[PDB]
């Protein structure tokens, strides 16, 4: 289950202000490679990772025409939703869209995805069989019947089984130097005295890729889950990620605490002390 | 690359 490709659309109506804003973003695994914003001077699908820049002008044109046209689609879908739910044309609303493929280490499809949201809540979702839909409510139920009759699933299944898989394989090959070489975390432990009796030990994981990581504290080799303060994994800004884990420990007793780091880029799980 | 629908996913 090594890899994935993902596209995310956000369509935000803003009555009073201009036409609804449309933003699209594309990812391979935890790397953003592509970007579109209907608010820009001249809206274009634009690169966000070194390895996509090598696609020629017709890739960029085709992707741009798609996004402009997808904008129109969701711009209209906002108005339909407005009617299905009987909402004021003065209110601002948001449609979100997700789709993409998962592949195993072999490059073969594991599953595809296509989900839509309205104002932050599930709306309709393609089932894992890529043949049927699950509506979240009675408004989405009308869509399901429209999409069933228009056989909208057929094209999605074709994309996800085919083009999604093949372009992802292409991208993983072109970007192999960065996409397929896991960067292990740089780890250190810091000491912060909070009184005479107690200090915080903070275990740091820095500059790692991909985002998935496990940090745990042990005392005398036994787990310390209830007592561990974990922060959410956060972007460094340079396409890598950071996380830390902390535990409050009595003075002098620091050597009994060990931090444990698991990440796909480490040959073996780390064990760290202060 | 992005999905390019033949048939609009119209609500």
């Amino acid at each position, epitope marked *: 289950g090594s890899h994935s490709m993902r596209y995310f659309y956000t369509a935000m109506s803003r009555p009073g202000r201009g036409e609804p804003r449309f933003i699209a973003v594309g990812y391979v695994d935890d790397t953003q490679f592509v970007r579109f914003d209907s608010d820009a001077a001249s809206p274009r699908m634009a690169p966000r990772a070194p390895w996509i820049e090598q696609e020629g002008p*017709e890739y960029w044109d*085709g992707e741009t025409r*798609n996004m402009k*046209a997808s904008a*129109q689609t969701y711009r*209209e879908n906002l108005r339909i939703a407005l009617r299905y739910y009987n909402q004021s044309e003065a209110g601002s609303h948001i449609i979100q869209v997700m789709y993409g493929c998962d592949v195993g280490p072999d490059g073969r499809l594991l599953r595809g995805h296509d989900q839509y949201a309205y104002d932050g809540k599930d709306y309709i979702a393609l089932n894992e069989d890529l043949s049927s839909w699950t509506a979240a409510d009675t408004a989405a139920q009308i869509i399901q019947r429209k999409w069933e*009759a*228009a*056989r909208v699933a*057929e*094209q999605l299944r*074709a*994309y996800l*089984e*085919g*083009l999604c898989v093949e372009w992802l394989r292409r991208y993983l090959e072109n970007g192999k130097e960065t996409l397929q070489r896991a960067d292990p975390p740089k780890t250190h432990v810091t000491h912060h005295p909070i009184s005479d009796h107690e200090a915080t030990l903070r275990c740091w994981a820095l500059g790692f890729y991909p985002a998935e990581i496990t940090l745990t504290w042990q005392r005398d080799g036994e787990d310390q889950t209830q007592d561990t303060e974990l922060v959410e994994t956060r972007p460094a800004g340079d396409r890598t990620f950071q996380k830390w884990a902390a535990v409050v420990v009595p003075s002098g007793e620091e050597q009994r605490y060990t931090c444990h780091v698991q990440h796909e880029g480490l040959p073996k799980p780390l064990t760290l002390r202060w | 690359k992005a999905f*390019s*629908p*033949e*048939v*609009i996913p*119209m609500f």
Partner: T-cell receptor
Amino acid sequence: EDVEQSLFLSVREGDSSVINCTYTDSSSTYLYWYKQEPGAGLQLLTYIFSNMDMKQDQRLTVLLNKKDKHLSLRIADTQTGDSAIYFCAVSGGYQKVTFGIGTKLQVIP
Amino acid sequence: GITQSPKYLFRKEGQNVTLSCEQNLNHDAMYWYRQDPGQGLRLIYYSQIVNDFQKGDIAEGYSVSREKKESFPLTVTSAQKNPTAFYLCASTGSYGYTFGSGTRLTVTE
């Protein structure tokens, strides 16, 4: 986009006819065949996604060679009523389709 | 599903004429094409939804409107020095196009 098909084509009734099409663009992921009686409208016969090697419906078989950007339509056991103009068409999406010029098929009884 | 009437139309050079196209299929998108010998199908105008019309590839001298669903009337002005063609009205709901049976316009000197 540029789609080319033979003007061509005359077969004996009962034989099998094949009509050919090529297109130039890799973005053409939706591929179609239509037929038209002269003086009337196009009628949709088949569609296929670039995903698929082949598709079959009764007497009709469509093969696609994505590598060769080559689309073909096979009509099994042609009849008199099969005589018509056949159009392949291709789209990259949004029904922004390019039609070929059409292949006139004559079925000799 | 789609009806175009009348089947034939005749007009003197330099005179406006509106062609009729009606549908009972409840499709959102409708299209106008022309067909000429030694040429396939050239788009003129299209409408993905009521109150919205976009120029096709060859709109020089054409105008359309969409005020209701159901209907998409094309108007031919003193457009080109060649408004004589076969005109086909079309709509989309699912993969591919549904076509009307077409109208022949002959414009004479």
